[PDB]
Amino acid sequence: FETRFEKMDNLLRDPKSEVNSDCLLDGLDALVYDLDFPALRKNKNIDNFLSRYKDTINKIRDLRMKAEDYEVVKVIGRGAFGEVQLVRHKSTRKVYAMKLLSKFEMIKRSDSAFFWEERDIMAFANSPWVVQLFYAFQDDRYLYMVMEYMPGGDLVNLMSNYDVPEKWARFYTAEVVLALDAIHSMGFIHRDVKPDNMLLDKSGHLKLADFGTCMKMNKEGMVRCDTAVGTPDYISPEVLKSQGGDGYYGRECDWWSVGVFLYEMLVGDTPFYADSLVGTYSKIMNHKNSLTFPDDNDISKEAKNLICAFLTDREVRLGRNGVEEIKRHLFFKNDQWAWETLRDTVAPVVPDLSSDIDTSNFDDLEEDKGEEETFPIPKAFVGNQLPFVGFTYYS
Amino acid sequence: MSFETRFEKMDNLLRDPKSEVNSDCLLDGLDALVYDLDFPALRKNKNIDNFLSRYKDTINKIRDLRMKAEDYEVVKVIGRGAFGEVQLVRHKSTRKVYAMKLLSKFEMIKRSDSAFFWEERDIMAFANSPWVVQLFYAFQDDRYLYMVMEYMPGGDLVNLMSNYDVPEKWARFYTAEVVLALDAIHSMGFIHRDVKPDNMLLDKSGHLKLADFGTCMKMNKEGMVTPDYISPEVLKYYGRECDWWSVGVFLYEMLVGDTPFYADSLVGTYSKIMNHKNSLTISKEAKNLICAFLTDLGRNGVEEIKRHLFFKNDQWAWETLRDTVAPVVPDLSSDIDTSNFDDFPIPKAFVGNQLPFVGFTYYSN
Numbered sequence A: 001f002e003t004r005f006e007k008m009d010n011l012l013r014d015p016k017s018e019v020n021s022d023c024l025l026d027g028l029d030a031l032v033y034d035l036d037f038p039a040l041r042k043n044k045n046i047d048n049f050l051s052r053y054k055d056t057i058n059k060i061r062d063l064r065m066k067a068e069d070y071e072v073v074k075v076i077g078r079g080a081f082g083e084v085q086l087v088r089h090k091s092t093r094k095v096y097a098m099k100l101l102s103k104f105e106m107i108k109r110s111d112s113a114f115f116w117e118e119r120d121i122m123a124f125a126n127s128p129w130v131v132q133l134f135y136a137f138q139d140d141r142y143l144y145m146v147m148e149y150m151p152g153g154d155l156v157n158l159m160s161n162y163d164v165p166e167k168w169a170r171f172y173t174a175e176v177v178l179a180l181d182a183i184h185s186m187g188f189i190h191r192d193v194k195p196d197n198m199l200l201d202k203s204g205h206l207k208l209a210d211f212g213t214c215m216k217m218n219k220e221g222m223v224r225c226d227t228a229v230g231t232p233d234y235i236s237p238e239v240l241k242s243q244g245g246d247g248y249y250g251r252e253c254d255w256w257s258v259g260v261f262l263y264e265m266l267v268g269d270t271p272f273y274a275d276s277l278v279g280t281y282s283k284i285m286n287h288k289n290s291l292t293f294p295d296d297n298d299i300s301k302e303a304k305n306l307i308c309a310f311l312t313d314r315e316v317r318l319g320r321n322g323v324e325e326i327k328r329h330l331f332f333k334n335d336q337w338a339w340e341t342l343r344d345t346v347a348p349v350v351p352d353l354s355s356d357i358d359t360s361n362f363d364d365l366e367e368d369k370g371e372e373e374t375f376p377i378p379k380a381f382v383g384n385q386l387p388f389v390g391f392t393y394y395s
Numbered sequence B: 001m002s003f004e005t006r007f008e009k010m011d012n013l014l015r016d017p018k019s020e021v022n023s024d025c026l027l028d029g030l031d032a033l034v035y036d037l038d039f040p041a042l043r044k045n046k047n048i049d050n051f052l053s054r055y056k057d058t059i060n061k062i063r064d065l066r067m068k069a070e071d072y073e074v075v076k077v078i079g080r081g082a083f084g085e086v087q088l089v090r091h092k093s094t095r096k097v098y099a100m101k102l103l104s105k106f107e108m109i110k111r112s113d114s115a116f117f118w119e120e121r122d123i124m125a126f127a128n129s130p131w132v133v134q135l136f137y138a139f140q141d142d143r144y145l146y147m148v149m150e151y152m153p154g155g156d157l158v159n160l161m162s163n164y165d166v167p168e169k170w171a172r173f174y175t176a177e178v179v180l181a182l183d184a185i186h187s188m189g190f191i192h193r194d195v196k197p198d199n200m201l202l203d204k205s206g207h208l209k210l211a212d213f214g215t216c217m218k219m220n221k222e223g224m225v226t227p228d229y230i231s232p233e234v235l236k237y238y239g240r241e242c243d244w245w246s247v248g249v250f251l252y253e254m255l256v257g258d259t260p261f262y263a264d265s266l267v268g269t270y271s272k273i274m275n276h277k278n279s280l281t282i283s284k285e286a287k288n289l290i291c292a293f294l295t296d297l298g299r300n301g302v303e304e305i306k307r308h309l310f311f312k313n314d315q316w317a318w319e320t321l322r323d324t325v326a327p328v329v330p331d332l333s334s335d336i337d338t339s340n341f342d343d344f345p346i347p348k349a350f351v352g353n354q355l356p357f358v359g360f361t362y363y364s365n
């Protein structure tokens, strides 16, 4: 009684806990979803449980956060397992960006663990470099992530809408460096650094948005991965080389992607662009001969040096000896801003916003996903809702 | 509905001890899920393996933290029922003395009885009456259901009737205490259906308290719902009047020594109850009350029972009856005195044997 009890109360209250109040309700909720089928109901035990808990769980479902509580303005983005839509909470009238993740497409493949790091990072980062997660909830079909809306859009949109000069390229590269260092200080390697993940707020300042590929570093700041992760153009040779045996890499791989970002910002095209996706693979592996710069150059000596310093073999890459090695590069030596007060200074592009639901910085995309597949009626207990138990979070 | 009213209502649902979805009941679900899924055949499923790898360790941590059978030192077995036993226990940490009731989950699953304990749990835990044996803690493991209740050192009325030739002065007291005790159960919206001296327990003071509530049933619309105390209407819909029949059966056995329908053959008893007009064979008002309950009294209310000439006495009053001196006050030497007490298969697929027990865990305060 005195020896142990105090610890149990903390485990139920703690937001970082795996067995807190909201996570335990997820278990009861998942159990009802996975058992309520005629074939399964034949079992006296399964029928005994559902007859006692179906009515109260339906009462729970109505009380706790649901997709119905949010009014969808428009679809602003789309990923592999879902879509990002601009939403307004019906009661509070607060504007958010809601990320949906298809439980079907997640179960169909095997990806049912990637969201845990993303959820943890966004919800407990408390950094102006990470897109904040206010609420996380779920139903039988999706995983919902209620995050802060970034009205300035992504860097892909900025690079297509503007001929980015070196003064702007210096700002956005430095912001990415400080943003990645915040992720590194949290003990993570991003593994998917690209302009699609770099989002801008109402002020026009950078924030990292997707953390699905994030992996916790060991005591040596290293990681072991048998399967390569990222995007064909921004992938580093060491991560691209991943296979069962030699898949050993640290935080240096994220700095490669920074150089890939800087090249695309100043040139207009990705450094290892090929018309065939296999052609890109060979170009990255042969960076010693593939990395060229167009004959016409308005871009500085120090810009090409930082690009080439990042775009080298893992061992000779810049940033191997910490972030201070990057911060001290001649390319970042300017007069307009300082490393410690960079986010406090005026951004190059400040979004001209008319309303709280302004989507000018987001390109229109096909709203209809057709007809999404739903799990077939099981003949026995499969428990498709089990890998999602504990996802619900509140702030 | 809505915000923050829906959040407020949710917070109450998690804190409320009477709630089916409170903190302690939700942990039972997660705990049952681990017990029912952790098997090699079931672990083959990627989803079942994903859940177990993520929650097995923390659930083991919770099992150690939460109340368990190991926390109690068993003094001796004081009783035994169909699906378990009642044992006198001492909590290892607090050193507090209780009476612990065990209920075999295997025996409960083997038959079909997996709902009878819910009424008993609800009554004992939320009665807050000096007529009901209080339930302090309710917990469970993969094998049993545990009920940590208050110890009744005076024993049962069966032991009293065998150890004493109960006079009318004593019979008047114990019958009246049963009446007030049953009225408390009725006011809670429950029908006992098995009122017998085996269920009537006495405290350190020597005052009555109802104990076994396995046979209880919650009232429907307004007030509608093993041997020998059974009424003809139950034996073959009825109200609270069936419990009053058993009161008369108790009073007859207290004064005569034998039950009014006692038969050498158990089938003979069944026929005797149905023919109570001819089967029913030392005071005038005592016999008048036995015949009053043994009909087809208590039809309207409890006041008609209270106003009977048999209850008219000089020694006690209905409102202060439990405050007066009891006829038999137990002579107790220690806090663990027992003088008044006479001495599963590995599934090939998801069966979920722990599911009918989810929500049983309770902690008062």
Ligand SMILES: CN(C)[C@H]1CCc2nc(NC(=O)c3cccc([C@H]4CCCN4C(=O)Nc4cccc(C#N)c4)c3)sc2C1
Pocket (backbone or CB within 6 Å): A077, A078, A079, A080, A081, A082, A083, A084, A097, A099, A100, A101, A111, A114, A131, A147, A148, A149, A150, A151, A196, A199, A209, A210, A212, A213
């Ligand atoms: C292979 N395995 C191991 C896994 C590796 C990690 C991973 N991540 C996935 N992720 C997705 O399925 C997904 C769904 C919707 C949107 C987005 C992004 C990509 C397009 C925009 N976006 C995004 O998150 N935007 C966002 C985020 C935050 C705020 C705002 C705003 N305003 C916008 C991603 S699927 C998957 C498989």
Ligand SMILES: CN(C)[C@H]1CCc2nc(NC(=O)c3cccc([C@H]4CCCN4C(=O)Nc4cccc(C#N)c4)c3)sc2C1
Pocket (backbone or CB within 6 Å): B078, B079, B080, B081, B082, B083, B084, B085, B086, B099, B101, B102, B103, B113, B116, B133, B149, B150, B151, B152, B153, B201, B211, B212, B214, B215
């Ligand atoms: C057929 N169906 C529908 C169900 C009808 C209701 C029912 N009840 C059962 N009940 C049991 O299995 C059981 C287990 C242990 C003890 C006791 C009692 C019977 C002997 C004493 N006792 C008891 O509860 N004593 C008690 C209680 C409280 C405090 C103290 C003390 N001190 C002592 C009963 S099995 C069952 C089947």
